[PDB]
Amino acid sequence: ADATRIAAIVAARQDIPGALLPILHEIQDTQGYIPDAAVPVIARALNLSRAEVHGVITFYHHFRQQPAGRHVVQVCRAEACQSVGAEALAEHAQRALGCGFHETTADGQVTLEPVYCLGQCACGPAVMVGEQLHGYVDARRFDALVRSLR
Amino acid sequence: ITITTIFVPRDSTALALGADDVARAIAREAAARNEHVRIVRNGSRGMFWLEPLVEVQTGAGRVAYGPVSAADVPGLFDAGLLQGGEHALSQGVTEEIPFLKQQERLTFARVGITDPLSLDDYRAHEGFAGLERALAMQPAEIVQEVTDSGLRGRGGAAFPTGIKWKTVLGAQSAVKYIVCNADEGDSGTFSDRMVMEDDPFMLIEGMTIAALAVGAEQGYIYCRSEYPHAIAVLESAIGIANAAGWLGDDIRGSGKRFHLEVRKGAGAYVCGEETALLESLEGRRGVVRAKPPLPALQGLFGKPTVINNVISLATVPVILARGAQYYRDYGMGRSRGTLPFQLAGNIKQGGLVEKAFGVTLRELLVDYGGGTRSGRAIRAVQVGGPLGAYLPESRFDVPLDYEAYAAFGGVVGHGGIVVFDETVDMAKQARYAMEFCAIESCGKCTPCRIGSTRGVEVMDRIIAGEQPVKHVALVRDLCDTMLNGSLCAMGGMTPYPVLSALNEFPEDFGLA
Numbered sequence: 001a002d003a004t005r006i007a008a009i010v011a012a013r014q015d016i017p018g019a020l021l022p023i024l025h026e027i028q029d030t031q032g033y034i035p036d037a038a039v040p041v042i043a044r045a046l047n048l049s050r051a052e053v054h055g056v057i058t059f060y061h062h063f064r065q066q067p068a069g070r071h072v073v074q075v076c077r078a079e080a081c082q083s084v085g086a087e088a089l090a091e092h093a094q095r096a097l098g099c100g101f102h103e104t105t106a107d108g109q110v111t112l113e114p115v116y117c118l119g120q121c122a123c124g125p126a127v128m129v130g131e132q133l134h135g136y137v138d139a140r141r142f143d144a145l146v147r148s149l150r
Numbered sequence: 151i152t153i154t155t156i157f158v159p160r161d162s163t164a165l166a167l168g169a170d171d172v173a174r175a176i177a178r179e180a181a182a183r184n185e186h187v188r189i190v191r192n193g194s195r196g197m198f199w200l201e202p203l204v205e206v207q208t209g210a211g212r213v214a215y216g217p218v219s220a221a222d223v224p225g226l227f228d229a230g231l232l233q234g235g236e237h238a239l240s241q242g243v244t245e246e247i248p249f250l251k252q253q254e255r256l257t258f259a260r261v262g263i264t265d266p267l268s269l270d271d272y273r274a275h276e277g278f279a280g281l282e283r284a285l286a287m288q289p290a291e292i293v294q295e296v297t298d299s300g301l302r303g304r305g306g307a308a309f310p311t312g313i314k315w316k317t318v319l320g321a322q323s324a325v326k327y328i329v330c331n332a333d334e335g336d337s338g339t340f341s342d343r344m345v346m347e348d349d350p351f352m353l354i355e356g357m358t359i360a361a362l363a364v365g366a367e368q369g370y371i372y373c374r375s376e377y378p379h380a381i382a383v384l385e386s387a388i389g390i391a392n393a394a395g396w397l398g399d400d401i402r403g404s405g406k407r408f409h410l411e412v413r414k415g416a417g418a419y420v421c422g423e424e425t426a427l428l429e430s431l432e433g434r435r436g437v438v439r440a441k442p443p444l445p446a447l448q449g450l451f452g453k454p455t456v457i458n459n460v461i462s463l464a465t466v467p468v469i470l471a472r473g474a475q476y477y478r479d480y481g482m483g484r485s486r487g488t489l490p491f492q493l494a495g496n497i498k499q500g501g502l503v504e505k506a507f508g509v510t511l512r513e514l515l516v517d518y519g520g521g522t523r524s525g526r527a528i529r530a531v532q533v534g535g536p537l538g539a540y541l542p543e544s545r546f547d548v549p550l551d552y553e554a555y556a557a558f559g560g561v562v563g564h565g566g567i568v569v570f571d572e573t574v575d576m577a578k579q580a581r582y583a584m585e586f587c588a589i590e591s592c593g594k595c596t597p598c599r600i601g602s603t604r605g606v607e608v609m610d611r612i613i614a615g616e617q618p619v620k621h622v623a624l625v626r627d628l629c630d631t632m633l634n635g636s637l638c639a640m641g642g643m644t645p646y647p648v649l650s651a652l653n654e655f656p657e658d659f660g661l662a
């Protein structure tokens with residue numbers, strides 16, 4: 001993570017109304033995560049306390065405080081995907097990858113995350129990798145798309 | 151000299167089903183055959199079982215093929231694609247497909263017809279006609295027009311939109327805001343997503359009319375982080391509208407000012423609650439605010455704030471362009487207008503069905519949906535999202551109308567419809583409702599934050615077959631605690647799927 005770029009990211013946004021979430025997004029988008037060492041920089045620029053900033057980072061599931069694997073694979077767990085087999089897909093994904101949700105494979109290639117609806121509810125089970133969507137995902141298609149990543 | 155226009159959708163559902171690969175295969179095939187095509191990346195018509203849905207402009211109108219995979223493209227060319235030749239995947243003239251033709255697409259009129267980022271396409275199909283009329287009215291007249299239309303909040307609470315705007319207009323404040331709630335966190339919903347990806351200018355126009363109606367010069371679209379495509383498309387559209395004078399400090403030379411920006415959410419379902427949304431916009435944890443102060447009076451940064459759902463705002467332009475009485479004539483009772491219903495889940499023909507209020511669930515399930523994807527019988531349908539009740543077949547003939555659903559404990563909500571077939575385990579559904587509440591609780595209320603997890607534990611005992619009668623009673627008790635001790639609908643409506651599952655399918659819980 002590039003500490004100097006983080007300071008610039010914060011400085012460019014520090015007068016935006018409600019700048020904290022846009023700042024956290026830009027740090028995560030460019031560095032991969034929000035490092036603990038960025039919190040004092042954010043806090044000072046926004047005249048917020050460090051605990052306040054850390055509490056926001058902790059509250060929102062989208063934000064991560066440590067790097068993910070090369071690819072974040074999100075498997076939808078919500079109702080419409082459930083109705084067409086999301087539960088079995090989630091069980092298979094953990095067996096095929098060898099790790100649970102919120103975990104990263106041993107080779108560091110895939111981080112498996114749940115997501116609660118991708119707005120793909122009529123063509124599930126739905127999976128997102130980075131920003132690439134996949135519909136109608138069964139065990140075969142899952143293994144295929146994971147193969148493509150590696 | 152001769153160029154054939156081909157449409158390949160760029161809606162994220164079409165993209166999830168391979169539309170970019172189809173578009174590249176069509177381009178590669180045209181080049182291999184020395185034929186000239188213009189591949190327009192339209193929104194989606196919303197017939198998702200046919201996506202990617204390729205359309206070709208012919209003398210007879212646009213004809214459709216679907217669903218198309220990249221491997222099908224050489225055969226499509228061989229069968230005469232560029233002339234609308236018949237193929238296994240042919241669907242005929244697109245506007246003649248009954249699923250699409252038998253709709254009342256007031257809000258979704260352009261969706262799938264246009265290039266979503268083309269101002270020329272937008273304005274060739276009535277785009278900005280509502281804004282042009284609104285620029286010639288006094289603010290109170292715009293409020294009155296939206297009032298007369300009968301429009302109610304399409305986020306689900308169905309509060310009369312014009313009354314909401316009247317409050318913001320009448321408030322005394324130099325700074326007022328328009329806030330679009332694009333958090334669309336409910337499973338089974340994608341109508342907001344489709345507006346933002348497939349007809350973004352309509353949302354921009356609707357928010358600009360709202361700004362004119364109440365005296366706001368700044369707007370914010372709060373879009374969930376799960377929708378990266380919507381966010382990218384809205385940002386491009388805002389840039390394009392600004393460059394052409396539809397936004398900024400001198401909109402179309404009127405001297406009216408409106409600036410708009412997109413804010414990305416961060417994975418919290420509860421930020422669809424309007425005050426938790428405001429907290430997030432202001433950079434804080436998404437904790438629901440006590441609501442003796444209405445956001446319409448003290449909202450974003452304590453200023454008078456219009457907060458409306460994407461569909462609510464996106465319906466404002468047609469209300470202005472065609473008039474309140476035209477809009478009000480659709481529907482039934484107090485449910486005036488149309489709603490983009492969303493058919494989702496275990497559904498054979500899922501997608502977007504905009505219809506006047508009063509259509510029944512059975513009509514949508516059978517006449518449009520074609521039954522389940524699996525072919526098994528429908529067993530339970532959750533309407534209105536994860537906080538809606540499960541409906542059994544005995545309720546499928548209630549008209550989809552806010553008051554008629556409320557009367558029996560149904561929730562129209564945003565109009566999303568999630569179909570479960572006979573394999574569904576309603577005890578596992580009840581457990582999930584509790585798990586989801588435990589995951590998403592903002593934490594302010596004890597029954598929501600901790601009671602939900604105890605409900606999971608008890609449901610686990612029920613699913614393992616341990617003392618079903620005792621533990622169902624405990625769940626019932628916990629539900630009453632949530633009904634009476636929740637400060638917003640996350641905790642307060644979690645009992646709706648739980649109690650409807652338990653009441654309608656007690657056999658799944660081990661009971662008689």
Ligand SMILES: Cc1cc2nc3c(=O)[nH]c(=O)nc-3n(C[C@H](O)[C@H](O)[C@H](O)COP(=O)(O)O)c2cc1C
Pocket residue numbers: 302303304305306307308309331332333334335336419420421422423424425457458459460462463638639640
């Ligand atoms: C848990 C919870 C989630 C909600 N999610 C949404 C949403 O995703 N989109 C929306 O428009 N309203 C949502 N609401 C309703 C908003 O609080 C509020 O009704 C909003 O102002 C709707 O504007 P409208 O009048 O145009 O419907 C949610 C409420 C709760 C309690």
Ligand code: SF4
Pocket residue numbers: 420438590591592593594595596598599636637638639640641642
């Ligand atoms: S009911 Fe739940 S989400 Fe709503 S205010 Fe209480 S703790 Fe927060």
Ligand code: FES
Pocket residue numbers: 076077078079080081082116117118119120121124126336337338339
């Ligand atoms: S429930 Fe999975 S994409 Fe909506």
